[PDB]
Point group: C3
Chain length 45, copies 3
């Protein structure tokens, strides 16, 4: 169904960028949480 | 390596949509959690 | 602004793949957590 311009590709390309930037930040808080949970487990809680 | 059709671009475009929709919902639960954790901290736990 | 090649589309296409793969894994840990929270609630905590 038609051609694709670089303008819309670039546009879509940035959305993917923001997703990577936001998903990386999320994954990080989860690791930082999943690990105090671990310290708590090592401590007896 | 070749041309890109609007059909596959549109297709990819929707996957990115679902990702934004799902990632937004995730980020939200995390904020809603990261904040009772805060209420708990303000309360003494 | 120009044409889009299949090489860069394919490339972008994989980034979207990794995002789906990583986001699915995240969503899962959240469900697995959001549910012991539920078992804890059913138990009285």
């Amino acid at each position: 169904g038609g051609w694709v311009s670089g303008e819309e590709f670039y546009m879509l390309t940035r959305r993917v960028l923001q997703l990577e930037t936001v998903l990386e930040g999320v994954v990080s808080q989860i690791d930082a949480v999943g690990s105090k949970l671990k310290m708590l487990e090592r401590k007896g809680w």
